[PDB]
């Protein structure tokens, strides 16, 4: 985009976890699709195992990430539980008109 100033499209292929309501099981319409999603792992937890498996991170780094997950999960649950308890001249002169009337004949050389 910065090199050619042209639109770029990124198609992110993922999956919808739940229907469009609390009591919506779209397995009525797409049973095969939702049978796969039933046995899927979260795109955050799966990536966590991949970094351990590839030797990118250790079990100490797995604890640094798991403590950060709870530290950010508790962060919003407690902040919300605490914040819940605390609840004109519209005309011009003729000389201006004569400037606009002359601009139509102020043609370039």
């Amino acid at each position: 985009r910065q090199a050619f100033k042209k639109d770029v499209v990124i198609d992110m292929l993922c999956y919808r976890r739940r229907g469009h309501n609390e009591g919506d099981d779209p397995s009525m319409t797409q049973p095969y699709m939702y049978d796969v999603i039933d046995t899927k792992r979260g795109s955050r937890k799966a990536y966590t195992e991949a970094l351990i498996g590839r030797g990118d991170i250790s079990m100490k780094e797995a604890e640094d990430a798991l403590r950060d997950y709870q530290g950010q999960l508790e962060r919003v649950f407690n902040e919300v539980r605490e914040l819940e308890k605390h609840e004109l001249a519209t005309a011009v002169d003729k000389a201006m008109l004569q400037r606009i009337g002359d601009a139509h004949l102020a043609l370039p050389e």
Binding site: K45, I52, G53, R54, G55, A62, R67, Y69
Partner: peptide, 30 residues
């Protein structure tokens, strides 16, 4: 790689052995 399967049995049979921070990660595995 290793504790993806190993600490899952150390927590399901005895949850006191596995660190209390891995309980909110090993439950969502199986």
């Amino acid at each position: 790689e290793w504790l993806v399967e190993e600490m899952y049995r150390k927590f399901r049979d005895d949850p006191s052995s596995v660190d209390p921070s891995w309980h909110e990660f090993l439950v969502d595995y199986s």
